[PDB]
Design a protein around this ligand. Structure first.
Ligand SMILES: Nc1ncnc2c1ncn2[C@@H]1O[C@H](COP(=O)(O)OP(=O)(O)O)[C@@H](O)[C@H]1O
Ligand SMILES: [Mg+2]
Length: 388
């Protein structure tokens, strides 16, 4: 008769995004409300001023609430940060009456997640990877099948206990309930990935301001989750230091004229820059600016490439699919720079594409930017939370 709504909120380093979407019978999300606000009160270490973030959240909430003609009461909250980690466990149970029932599934996943976890961490996501019923490896939906012993591979995403307290207080002080805390990198791949790319094998890199969220899917299952604490802010620091310009201006010139490949930028495109110390403005070439951006971006993607390969090795020792036939998907705000899909192709030596949010309709023009990957992914994750 009506409409099922899902609202996602991302309190980022520079933007606070609130998205309102309808669940359609398709499985697509009809985005009917957008809310943007400059994220005031958050360092990269986290929240430094609660009252500022409360006004920021309710501002973004009020705009999307009015644009959608609804009443937001609960949200799906994103969560980024340095102290996010992962681990993989393996459980095994005797199959009840030699036919896999739901209680068989629930206990083997329970015995996998009931393990010692990284010092000062709690389980944020319990994601089963695949099941093995009597040496039929790689089973996704195993309920109903026959067998004696069943193995389950479960992927655990863990986070520090306190790293969410501030942003939960911020949202709760706006009269809103937190439906669930979602890892930002997880929601990102929910938005930019197709299901066949997970089957073929892919690696998503959510490139924000302070973190690079990396997820690796092989054989249709999430294999790895890694947070690298170096992103677009380190690139901005290079421009501010290599040219002697305020970081507020180094951020402007990077988004306005930056490029990850000095190979493709012309020699006659010249940019102007305000200098520090009240000293006269300087004039540099777009190519020279790209010659500063390229070494850092290459170094960052090599950190991801180094993480992909050593994971691929350990997967080879375990007899699990490992090849990334779908390639690399770079997403996030830091992935929107020119020439990046080409700079990454020289690093990973495979197909690279810049992914935007998928599977959406309505106000798609407002959230089609790769920086909206996490925000849209909160809508899809919450949609899957409903139908289940
Ligand atoms: N057109 C662009 N070119 C290069 N970098 C960009 C561009 N747009 C945004 N960025 C970078 O992306 C980062 C912000 O991405 P975002 O996903 O909003 O961060 P977070 O996930 O931490 O909130 C900033 O560091 C910014 O410099
Ligand atoms: Mg982002």
């Amino acid at each position: 008769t009506d409409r099922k709504l899902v609202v996602g909120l991302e309190i980022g380093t520079a933007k606070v995004s609130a998205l309102v979407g309808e669940i359609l019978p398709d499985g697509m999300v009809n985005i009917i409300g957008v809310g943007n606000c400059p994220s005031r009160g958050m360092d990269k270490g986290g929240v430094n001023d609660l009252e500022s973030v409360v006004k920021c959240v309710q501002r973004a909430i009020d705009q999307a609430e009015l644009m959608a003609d609804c009443q937001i009461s609960s949200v799906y909250l994103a969560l980024s940060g340095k102290h996010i980690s992962c681990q993989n466990e393996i459980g095994m149970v005797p199959v009840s009456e030699e036919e896999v029932t739901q209680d068989d599934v629930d206990s083997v996943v329970h015995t996998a997640k009931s393990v010692r976890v990284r010092d000062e961490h709690r389980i944020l996501h319990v994601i089963p990877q695949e099941y093995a019923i009597d040496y039929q490896e790689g089973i996704k939906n195993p309920v109903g099948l026959s067998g004696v012993r069943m193995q389950a591979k479960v992927h655990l995403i863990t986070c520090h206990n306190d790293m969410a307290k501030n942003i939960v207080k911020a949202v709760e002080r706006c009269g809103l309930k937190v439906d669930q805390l979602i890892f930002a990198g997880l929601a990102a791949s929910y938005a930019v990935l197709t299901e066949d790319e997970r089957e073929l094998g892919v690696c998503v890199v959510d490139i924000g301001g302070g973190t690079m969220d990396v997820a690796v899917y092989t054989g249709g299952a999430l294999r790895h989750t890694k947070v690298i604490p170096y992103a677009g802010n380190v690139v901005t620091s290079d421009i501010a230091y290599a040219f002697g310009t305020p970081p507020s201006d180094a951020e402007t010139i990077k988004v306005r004229h930056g490029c990850a490949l000095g190979s493709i930028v012309s020699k006659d495109e010249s940019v102007e820059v305000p200098s520090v110390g009240g000293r006269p403005p300087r004039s540099l070439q777009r190519q020279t600016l790209a010659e500063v951006i390229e070494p850092r971006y290459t170094e960052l993607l090599n950190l991801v490439n180094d993480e992909i390969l050593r994971l691929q090795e350990q997967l080879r020792q375990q007899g699990v699919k490992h090849h990334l036939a779908a390639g690399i998907v770079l997403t996030g705000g830091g992935a929107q720079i020119d020439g990046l899909a080409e700079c990454a192709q020289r690093v990973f030596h495979t197909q690279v594409r810049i992914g935007r949010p998928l599977n959406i309709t309505g106000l798609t023009d407002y959230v089609q930017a790769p920086c909206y990957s996490t925000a849209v992914g909160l809508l899809h994750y919450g949609k899957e939370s409903h139908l289940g």
